[PDB]
Amino acid sequence: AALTEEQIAEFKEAFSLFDKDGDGTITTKELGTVMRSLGQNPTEAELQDMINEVDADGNGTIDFPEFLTMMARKMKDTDSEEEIREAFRVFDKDGNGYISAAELRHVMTNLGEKLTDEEVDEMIREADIDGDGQVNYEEFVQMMTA
Amino acid sequence: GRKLELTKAEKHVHAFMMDTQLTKRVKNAAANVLRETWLIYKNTKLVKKIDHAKVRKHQRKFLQAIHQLRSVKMEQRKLNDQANTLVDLAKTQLE
Ligand SMILES: Cc1cc2c(cc1Br)NC(=O)/C2=N\O
Ligand SMILES: [Ca+2]
Ligand SMILES: [Ca+2]
């Protein structure tokens, strides 16, 4: 657990994503707002647990010191290839490892936040490696995570 | 930068037993797993004649304790991924 001086200043900006009113401390109410804006639905007890796991002095909120000290233990990352491949698999109707360019355009222009037809053109240009109108999403994901 | 990488999950459940409610739940359910495992074993292997009504009672209490422990473990995994969500959000500022 070592943080560079550069990581410390960047995590100060990060603290403001949570400390919504800027009074220097993260409360359960603020974490609920943050978590719901990320599309999750923690219960009150779950929010209290998140606070309590980091709140070193037991005053009920998280200050930047406690915030920063716990980030120091959580810096290890790992690749997302398999999880991304599983998101593509949601749209593999026949479970054959393929999604047609036509079906990918349909998905991307109708579900989620969506892409424009121009943006989907660029994505398919990269995703349809063999030029056969079909996306082998395992290979596409392996290219993007290489 | 980090590109598509995300915070690595801890390989084994090991967190949030500060909750007290989760800690009490684990202690009581685990003790009941021990209790009902013994009482099922005694009543199926250490008696002259099996009392099946007794066996059904302790099988009911056994499955409830086992599934209570499963419920705690799933709640620990949920809490751990909620916490990793917050870590991942903070790490977007490293870019
Ligand atoms: C950024 C952040 C991380 C965490 C937390 C609260 C905040 Br904010 N509570 C936690 O247990 C945790 N990581 O394990
Ligand atoms: Ca605040
Ligand atoms: Ca505190």
Residue numbers in the entry:
A (entry chain R): 2 to 147
B (entry chain B): 395 to 489
Give excerpts from the publication.
In the proximal carboxyl-terminus of the channels, there is a region called calmodulin binding domain (CaMBD). The Ca2+ binding protein calmodulin (CaM) that is constitutively associated at the CaMBD serves as the Ca2+ sensor of SK channels. In response to physiological signals, elevated intracellular Ca2+ levels enable Ca2+ binding to CaM, inducing conformational changes in the channel carboxyl- terminus and subsequently opening the channel pore. SK channels play essential roles in the regulation of membrane excitability by Ca2+ in both the central nervous and cardiovascular systems.
This was done utilizing four compounds,1-EBIO, NS309, SKS-11 (6-bromo-5-methyl-1H-indole-2,3-dione-3-oxime) and SKS-14 (7-fluoro-3-(hydroxyimino)indolin-2-one), varying up to 1000-fold in potency. Reminiscent of the binding pockets of 1-EBIO and NS30948,49, the binding site for SKS-11 and SKS-14 is also located at the interface of CaMBD and the CaM N-lobe. At the CaM-channel interface, between M51, M71, K75 of CaM and L480 of CaMBD, there is extra electron density apparently coming from SKS-11 and SKS-14, respectively. NS309, SKS-11, SKS-14 and 1-EBIO all primarily form contacts with L480 of the CaMBD and with M51, M71 and K75 of CaM. Similar to 1-EBIO and NS309, both SKS-11 and SKS-14 dose-dependently potentiated SK2 channel activity at 0.1 μM Ca2+. The total Eint is −43.5 kcal/mol for NS309, −38.8 kcal/mol for SKS-11, −32.6 kcal/mol for SKS-14 and −29.5 kcal/mol for 1-EBIO. For instance, the distance and angles (θ) from the main chain oxygen of M51 to the nitrogen in the five-member heterocyclic ring is 2.8 angstrom (θ = 134.7°) for NS309, 2.9 angstrom (θ = 164.2°) for SKS-11, 3.1 angstrom (θ = 129.7°) for SKS-14 and 4.1 angstrom (θ = 120.6°) for 1-EBIO.
